[PDB]
């Protein structure tokens, strides 16, 4: 298929904020590899004039989750949260970034 447009590797938290702050649509997001917690992933998401960040948590077996529902891949967790909100305070659905192209 195609590589996913949402995996940014080891981009600093502040550079994820810089990039997402130029996005127009709420829910534009990326997965990055945390610098403060090496070996952990973080999800950064545009919402309004902000950028929210969430830890990608692991269970004892290595499944990934944000809150309660967990998955066998980052790819399945991202796809799940295209239609189930990532936030408990707003309805925020992941959508791909509109890329410089
Ligand atoms: Na993680």
Swiss-Prot record:
Domain SH2: 6-98
Cross-link (Glycyl lysine isopeptide (Lys-Gly) (interchain with G-Cter in ubiquitin)): 55
Compartment(s) of residence: Nucleus; Cytoplasm; Endosome; Golgi apparatus
Post-translational modification: Ubiquitinated by RNF173, leading to proteasomal degradation and inhibition of the RAF/MEK/ERK pathway. In the nucleus, polyubiquitinated by RBBP6 at Lys-55 at DNA damage sites.
N6-acetyllysine modification, residue list: 55
Domain notes from UniProt: The SH3 domains mediate interaction with RALGPS1 and SHB.
Entry's family note: Belongs to the GRB2/sem-5/DRK family.
Job of this protein: Non-enzymatic adapter protein that plays a pivotal role in precisely regulated signaling cascades from cell surface receptors to cellular responses, including signaling transduction and gene expression. Thus, participates in many biological processes including regulation of innate and adaptive immunity, autophagy, DNA repair or necroptosis. Controls signaling complexes at the T-cell antigen receptor to facilitate the activation, differentiation, and function of T-cells.
UniProt subunit comment: Homodimer. Associates (via SH2 domain) with activated EGF and PDGF receptors (tyrosine phosphorylated). Interacts with PDGFRA (tyrosine phosphorylated); the interaction may be indirect. Also associates to other cellular Tyr-phosphorylated proteins such as SIT1, IRS1, IRS2, IRS4, SHC and LNK; probably via the concerted action of both its SH2 and SH3 domains. It also seems to interact with RAS in the signaling pathway leading to DNA synthesis. Interacts with SOS1. Forms a complex with MUC1 and SOS1, through interaction of the SH3 domains with SOS1 and the SH2 domain with phosphorylated MUC1.
Protein name: Growth factor receptor-bound protein 2
Native species: Homo sapiens (Human)
Lineage: Eukaryota, Metazoa, Chordata, Craniata, Vertebrata
């Amino acid at each position: 298929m195609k590589p996913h447009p949402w995996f940014f590797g080891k981009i600093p938290r502040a550079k994820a904020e810089e990039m997402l702050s130029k996005q127009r649509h709420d829910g534009a997001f990326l997965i990055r590899e945390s610098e403060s917690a090496p070996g952990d992933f973080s999800l950064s998401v545009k919402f309004g004039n902000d950028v929210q960040h969430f830890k990608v948590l692991r269970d004892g077996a290595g499944k990934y989750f944000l809150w309660v529902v967990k998955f066998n891949s980052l790819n399945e967790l991202v796809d799940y949260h295209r239609s189930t909100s990532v936030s408990r305070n707003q309805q925020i659905f992941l959508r791909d970034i509109e890329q410089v192209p």
